[PDB]
From a paper:
AtNIT4 is a left-handed helical tube with 4.9 sunbunits (dimers) in one helical turn, a pitch of 8.62 nm, an outer diameter of ~13 nm, and a ~2 nm hollow core. The extended C-terminal tail of each monomer forms two ß-strands, which assemble, along with strands from monomers across the A- and C-interfaces, into a row of 4-stranded ß-sheets in the interior of the tubular filament. Interactions across the helical groove (D- or F-interfaces) were not observed and this could explain the plasticity of NIT helical twist. AtNIT4 shows high-structural homology with other members of the NIT superfamily including a conserved αßßα core and CEEK catalytic tetrad. The NIT superfamily binding pocket has been described, but in addition to these shared elements, in AtNIT4 a loop from the adjacent monomer extends over the C-interface in line with C197. On this basis we refer to the loop as a lid, R95 as a lock, and the flexible ends of the loop as a hinge, which open or close, shifting the lid relative to C197. We propose: R95T eliminates the positive charge at position 95, which disrupts the interaction with D317 and allows the lid loop to open and shift away from C197.
NITs are attractive biocatalysts for the synthesis of amides and carboxylic acids for use in the manufacture of drugs and fine chemicals. We recently discovered that substrate specificity in plant NITs is related to the structure of the NIT helical assembly. The helical twist (Δϕ) of the NIT filament is correlated with the size of the preferred substrate: NIT4 enzymes have a relatively large helical twist, small substrate size, and high specificity, while NIT1 enzymes have a smaller twist and broader specificity. Here we present what we believe to be the first close-to-atomic structure of a full-length active helical NIT (EC 3.5.5.1) using cryo-electron microscopy at a resolution of 3.4 Å.
Numbering used by the authors:
A (entry chain J), B (entry chain I), C (entry chain K), D (entry chain L): 35 to 251, 276 to 347
Write the structure that this text describes.
């Protein structure tokens, strides 16, 4: 039996070493009630440009989109470097697992990744987003197959997906086949759609869905946590930003996979078969002696 | 713009020529208010044996399971035969598209299937169930890949799926790849969770989820109809049995795939690929000249 | 020695059977002066939505974006169908090689493509676009490697590329490696910089750059034709819409590759090597017997 | 914000310690207006034999080509040695970056290289030319892959290419992938071709193209400098030899890679992949204890 928290805080949107201390103080506030896994929202460090249209017609490209883009570009991080060392030392001071939605750069491109840290201040891995939704396709980049992680820990198998990658039916059945029983899902929408969409994943899987959204002032977000039977443990907090906690019986999975079981004794292998191409594809490839 | 009605009837459970007239005295009331498509519940003709355990221990097989089986086997139909001619001549008189949940026999087996009829009183095809759930595995049989239909009609394309075949992600993504926009889904469970399960399919797809359940006396069924924007038109009727109607604006689909749109442009063929083995596999095959 | 004409027409933008007769009443005027190859602008059939922003903030998705999308979706064609038969019967009567910029649909997606026709009124093939630019990423779709053609004809070899697929150096060097000597290039921007951009391709290759832009009323388009010595034959017509012609001496290529000549003898295979993955990748694949 | 100059001076063509002082005086003339990066033309020290045919038929090889060759060979330098020490001490006297087009020897062979120096009189590296063009194949040597440098400085990343190595599409996309934002390009031709050829590199990249040609008395060369948006800062000076200066806003790159970005979010890695063989290949290799 473990116990986990989600947060609901917002970011200061510019000056990224100013929002890097909010994480410190909230992480210490979540330390005190004996938490063991802490989840942070989507684009917590880099910031999420809400409302901004960058003045895009259909090929106008005015001068008041370029300055906006460079002011936004100048406020991201890069992994590894001096901003992941600080987070490792942050999670190393005591025993806590930390997942975190940042925005990284890699030579004038922006990615929307999520980082995974253990209880001894190592850096496990990252997961760049497969496909941005609508108007984020102008500003963010596409991820490939060689990123989707597994990450077995001594408290379970944790993995993640971001906003509307939780609608793709073929990425979920690749997450399921690797053995996920704790399914993190940060997001950036606050609808009635979302609460009724996470319940379906919690049933179709057998995992604890544990989501986190941000509250700012404008997307009054509601984060939650759902049992693998479909019962909400900690409700949709639509009022203010607060720490939300609950406890996770890991023996509630073996009993929830008595009726239904995807990848195992459902999903008739004699008719259906999915296969995943997981190759590190890159444009330019130097080889030396 | 079309309009379609689901029913929330119940069956007489025994003496199957008696329950075929309910399917007219409800039907003309359903079609007198200018209807165009009628959807019936799961196992409406044969009867869904509720509560019955058949005295199965672990392989004890007592005498009060055998008579209970044979009395149930004696109340099935067979296709094509004298009970589908009645349904064709039924749908031929007036004009409706009729879908129907039956139970068929084929030499001492039972297959939970669903039938499709057009407005000119012809027989389009059937869809047997892929996998029965828990204890229905003892009494029903398995389906193969060479059964999943779409049946393009002049009011749109119309597929189906039965109770917990709607949780299988591969079967849904194989339904979507042929172009379903009217997603009929009979069922036989009535919980709070099924509504949340159907909203997600309506959002993930772009189709009109149009479900149907039975209400008897313990089947507090709630059948509904969901827009492809995740809006319930005619709500979950938990009180009594009725006729449930709405209008189906088929121009509200092209506008819903401006955002999401699975396979193309939102599936990634470079990483994921699914394939389906649709072969008519049967045990003994006779060949002559 | 052949001769080819580009056009500088404009579309009626809505009601696409109306804009298909412009493609005859300009076409016979283009073919009456003894022409042999006709090139049309980018998105001449479906229409290029200029100025339109669809009210996309960051994921607000208001109600006046959906209707604007569906009215645009409703004005596309599909291949092969009743709108390409008209073009084949058009090109078949007299003798011309017809290339054409269209917009096609394939189950609620839009692909900005280009079509090739021979003189006997057959359909050679099509070339979808690899990557839409900035805000066209929301409304158009991506292309795979299994589309890039060359189509050896008895007047030479003829490929194509669309607006900013001419900046990608790898796609150009993959076009060159099959033996392009007539380089057709429709576009949808008209700046001072585009002429300087096309001169470099004409010198780097050895082909005839033969571009086409539309002029409407804001598309001050200027289309031209450039020798493989970097000499403009028929100039940048920025004033009004017209027909633009020249003669294409195909013996002025062998003489121009005396100096430069990419891949062999001027590429260095010992240091550089490029490779292309030309596989027809699609999401769901059905197999039967 | 840095500022850079190009020069347009010619050489004295023989007696290489007489042209080594012209560099000194011009470098001191460029010091006074607070310049910070100075670029010199192709073959500034060794001299470029213009007009000379060396009496080559097709294997005649007369005696009046041999004396010409030895008189030309006797006027090169060799790196390192007493002629690079002088340039290091020349650039060490104050704060300037010096790039320089010389001709080196290596045991009776001639190369066309380019030397890079820092602000503290170190010797960073060199770049021998990959393939000489037409009749320079008889007199110069081929370079290999283990020469093309990166050279990050505190004012940016400077790299170079020589005359017609700026036409190879595969060498540019190896320069781009390493991060070049200041692109030096000395040359030895004066056409209308060249000005329209550098604009394309400035757009296709995102870098400041900063070229330099020589004016002698006969190739009245025109040197220039182009913004990453395609706007000429300091024009094509076709009249006389002069110092040409401008200022280089390095925040104009981040804003120019908002629209288009090669190696990053263009150049689809799922279809194209270039790879470079970078090995120090030599014919005879002694090894000892």
């Amino acid at each position: 039996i473990v116990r986990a928290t989600v947060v609901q805080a917002s970011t200061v949107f510019y000056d990224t070493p100013a929002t890097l201390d909010k994480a410190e103080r909230l992480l210490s506030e979540a330390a005190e009630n004996g938490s063991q896994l802490v989840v942070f929202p989507e684009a917590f460090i880099g910031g999420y440009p809400r409302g901004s249209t960058f003045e895009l017609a259909i090929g106008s490209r005015t001068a008041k989109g370029r300055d906006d883009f460079r002011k936004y570009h100048a406020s991201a991080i890069d992994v590894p470097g001096p901003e992941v060392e600080r987070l490792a030392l942050m999670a190393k001071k005591y025993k806590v697992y930390l997942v975190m939605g940042v925005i990284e750069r890699e030579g004038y491109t922006l990615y929307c990744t999520v980082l995974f840290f253990d209880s001894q201040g190592l850096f496990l891995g990252k997961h760049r987003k497969l496909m941005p939704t609508a108007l984020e396709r102008c500003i963010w980049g596409f991820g490939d197959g060689s990123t989707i992680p597994v990450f077995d820990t001594p408290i379970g198998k944790i993995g993640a997906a971001i906003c509307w990658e939780n609608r793709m039916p073929s990425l979920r059945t690749a997450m399921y086949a690797k053995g996920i029983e704790i399914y993190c899902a940060p997001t950036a929408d606050s609808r009635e759609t979302w609460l009724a969409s996470m319940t379906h994943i919690a049933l179709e899987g057998g995992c604890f869905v544990l989501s986190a959204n941000q509250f700012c002032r404008v997307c009054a977000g509601g984060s939650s946590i759902i049992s693998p039977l479909g019962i909400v443990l900690a409700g949709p907090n639509y009022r203010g930003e607060a720490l939300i906690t609950a406890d996770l019986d890991l023996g509630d999975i073996a009993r929830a996979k008595f009726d239904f079981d995807v990848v195992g004794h459902y999903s008739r292998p004699e008719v259906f078969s999915l296969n995943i191409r997981e190759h590190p594809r890159k444009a330019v490839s130097f080889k030396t002696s």
